[PDB]
């Protein structure tokens, strides 16, 4: 079978920016990939639609997925509780990597980041579960609204999201 693909339609201060799509490595990290896929479709009744990228650091990453508190302090997985680091097979190889944010071992929720550089120091600490497929330029455009401390200068939202194919 085939790894799922999901998309995010991004907006900046409500104005459309573009679409970013991702391959989810369900072949390597099925549990992690499924969480992100389900939160993208909204099939459990909650997920990423309408949420924001609250922390963006140019040259580093864009982070989002806190759909409950909108600031890095919230979010939840589809598993009724934070969940474990499934494995660290996949590495932070370069721009476009999709990896889970966490607050220490086995604390995955819904927060994630999209790398804009190779972030090898996170290997073995954050679970890598996907990669941008199309629209890396859109992520580069988003990145320009970040700053040193991560605060964004315009509100970057996931206007729509779902599963492709």
Curated annotation (Swiss-Prot):
Class of this enzyme: isomerase
Modified residues (N6-acetyllysine): 28, 44, 76, 82, 125, 131, 133
Residues the record lists as Phosphothreonine modifications: 93
InterPro entries documented for this protein: Cyclophilin-like_dom_sf (IPR029000), Cyclophilin-type_PPIase (IPR024936), Cyclophilin-type_PPIase_CS (IPR020892), Cyclophilin-type_PPIase_dom (IPR002130)
Post-translational modification as stated in the protein's UniProt record: Acetylation at Lys-125 markedly inhibits catalysis of cis to trans isomerization and stabilizes cis rather than trans forms of the HIV-1 capsid. PPIA acetylation also antagonizes the immunosuppressive effects of cyclosporine by inhibiting the sequential steps of cyclosporine binding and calcineurin inhibition. Acetylation at Lys-125 favors its interaction with TARDBP.
Activity regulation, short description: Binds cyclosporin A (CsA). CsA mediates some of its effects via an inhibitory action on PPIase.
Pfam families attached to this UniProt entry: Pro_isomerase (PF00160)
Cross-link (Glycyl lysine isopeptide (Lys-Gly) (interchain with G-Cter in SUMO2)): 28, 82
GO biological process: activation of protein kinase B activity; apoptotic process; cell adhesion molecule production; cellular response to oxidative stress; endothelial cell activation; leukocyte chemotaxis; lipid droplet organization; negative regulation of oxidative stress-induced intrinsic apoptotic signaling pathway
EC identifiers of the protein: 5.2.1.8
One GO MF term attached to the UniProt entry: virion binding
Cross-link (Glycyl lysine isopeptide (Lys-Gly) (interchain with G-Cter in ubiquitin)): 28
Main location: cytoplasm
Effect of residue 121 to H: No effect on peptidyl-prolyl cis-trans isomerase activity
Catalytic function, reaction form: [protein]-peptidylproline (omega=180) = [protein]-peptidylproline (omega=0)
Residues bearing PTM N-acetylvaline: 2
A single GO cellular-component term on record: extracellular region
Entry-annotated residues carrying N-acetylmethionine: 1
Annotated localization: Cytoplasm; Secreted; Nucleus
Effect of residue 60 to A: Loss of ability to stimulate MAPK/ERK phosphorylation
Entries under CDD domains matching the protein: cyclophilin_ABH_like
Domain PPIase cyclophilin-type: 7-163
Assembly and oligomerization: Interacts with protein phosphatase PPP3CA/calcineurin A. Interacts with PRPF19 isoform 2 (via N-terminus). Interacts with isoform 2 of BSG/CD147. Interacts with FOXO1; the interaction promotes FOXO1 dephosphorylation, nuclear accumulation and transcriptional activity. Interacts with integrin ITGA2B:ITGB3; the interaction is ROS and peptidyl-prolyl cis-trans isomerase (PPIase) activity-dependent and is increased in the presence of thrombin. Interacts with MAP3K5.
Function as written in the Swiss-Prot or TrEMBL entry: Catalyzes the cis-trans isomerization of proline imidic peptide bonds in oligopeptides. Exerts a strong chemotactic effect on leukocytes partly through activation of one of its membrane receptors BSG/CD147, initiating a signaling cascade that culminates in MAPK/ERK activation. Activates endothelial cells (ECs) in a pro-inflammatory manner by stimulating activation of NF-kappa-B and ERK, JNK and p38 MAP-kinases and by inducing expression of adhesion molecules including SELE and VCAM1. (Microbial infection) May act as a mediator between human SARS coronavirus nucleoprotein and BSG/CD147 in the process of invasion of host cells by the virus.
Listed PANTHER family: PEPTIDYL-PROLYL CIS-TRANS ISOMERASE, PEPTIDYL-PROLYL CIS-TRANS ISOMERASE A
Protein name: Peptidyl-prolyl cis-trans isomerase A
The organism of origin for this protein: Homo sapiens
């Amino acid at each position: 079978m085939v790894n799922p693909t999901v998309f995010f339609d991004i907006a900046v201060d409500g104005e459309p920016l573009g679409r970013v799509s991702f391959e989810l490595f369900a072949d390597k990290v099925p549990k992690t990939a499924e969480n992100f896929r389900a939160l993208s479709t909204g099939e459990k009744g909650f997920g990423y639609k309408g949420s924001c990228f609250h922390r963006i650091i140019p040259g580093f990453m864009c982070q989002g997925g806190d759909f409950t508190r909108h600031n890095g302090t919230g979010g939840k997985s589809i598993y009724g509780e934070k969940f474990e680091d499934e494995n660290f097979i996949l590495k932070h190889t370069g721009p476009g990597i999709l990896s889970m944010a966490n607050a220490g071992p086995n604390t995955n929720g819904s927060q994630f980041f999209i790398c804009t550089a190779k972030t090898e120091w996170l290997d073995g600490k954050h679970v890598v579960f996907g990669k941008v497929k199309e629209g890396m330029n859109i992520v580069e455009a988003m990145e320009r609204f970040g700053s040193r401390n991560g605060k964004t200068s315009k509100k970057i939202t996931i206007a729509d999201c779902g599963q492709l194919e």
